[PDB]
């Protein structure tokens, strides 16, 4: 959980170009696929668990 967004998965550190006004990322299927650290700026791709 980062800023109220809960979930489960594996973080893989992507280089997705999140802009300053972007904190969450949803894929083509309206499914979360990336998030930003509320403290640092690292963009982590929420990949699915096994």
């Amino acid at each position: 959980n980062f800023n109220g967004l809960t979930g489960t998965g594996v973080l893989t550190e992507s280089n997705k170009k999140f802009l300053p006004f972007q904190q969450f990322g949803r894929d083509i299927a309206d499914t979360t696929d990336a998030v930003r650290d509320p403290q640092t700026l690292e963009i982590l791709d929420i990949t699915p668990c096994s």
Partner: peptide, 18 residues
Amino acid sequence: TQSYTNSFTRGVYYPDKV
């Protein structure tokens, strides 16, 4: 002074942080 141009593409923003 006060003329009237049309708003071509003017009038769209970002209603999200996605």
